Amino acid sequence: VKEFLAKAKEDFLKKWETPSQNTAQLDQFDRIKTLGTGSFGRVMLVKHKESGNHYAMKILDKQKVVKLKQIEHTLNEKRILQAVNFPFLVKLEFSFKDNSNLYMVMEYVAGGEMFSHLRRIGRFSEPHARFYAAQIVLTFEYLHSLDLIYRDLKPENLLIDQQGYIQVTDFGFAKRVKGRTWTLCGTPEYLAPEIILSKGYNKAVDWWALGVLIYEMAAGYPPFFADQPIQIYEKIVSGKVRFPSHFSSDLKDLLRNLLQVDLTKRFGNLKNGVNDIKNHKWFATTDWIAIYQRKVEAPFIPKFKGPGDTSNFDDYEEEEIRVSINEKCGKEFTEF
């Protein structure tokens, strides 16, 4: 994997150094329906006029981005998305901006969020959870090799494609850093303790997040939950985890090594790096090459009735995207 990553880094750097810009325009698409929403924007299913292809358009109101102080974060998201390339990372097809908004046009992943399937079904069996987990492990290995930290892992951001494989979306908090950073960001249930304690953290927070994700997928509920964020932080800081009766011995051990407050012990960060995870008993049945190559039998393949079908997504109240005859925040988003 050393040779692969070496070549992949070179490919990344060229794009990180000279990012693409203005590859489309609003009038080239017909906006159809909202697919999902987040704190900073909304994602819509759209159809490209000239090609007839469908895409998922993320729309960001520039003024809201400023108010919520996400300027630098939004610039991070777009610069990173246009430079990466991995089988489990959603593809940025186009990007552009207008007087009022910022746009990121991605490939439409019709299977819906893992979140919806997870809550409906209740929980995923271990082999089922392991299939998704393997893909995230590989994605983090790739991202971390480029000095990138994801920072927002959660079922809501993991889409299922037509083959049953995962496609990671939302790089709103993704950042390229060598060393440590201090931003208090992410989603409450997934924050590593270092983040909450404001001590400064590194890539290891992504590995702790993986632990939370695996736990949520296998249990059906997160390891630390409560009605209010602050109550959740107290549980995370205390650190004591409780496991369902159906969790295998191997799963509980892997988890104790991921949901580990001690950085000198948490898997993924140690000397052997990612191999401590890959070689773990819980993953003994995993063929890492086959997973990467997508040759493994997907345990679940979503129902899809042609292009433009959004049946795997909830419905959302539609909102008219505003326009203005005056350019807003021009200098702030110059590089977008």
Binding site: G38, F40, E156, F173, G186, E189, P222, F225
Partner: peptide, 20 residues
């Protein structure tokens, strides 16, 4: 049960990223 306490809680729906 832990499941019942979760299901009866206010955080069973889509969770948004933290925003100041």
């Amino acid at each position: 049960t832990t499941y019942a306490d979760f299901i009866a809680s206010g955080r069973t729906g889509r969770r948004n990223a933290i925003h100041d």
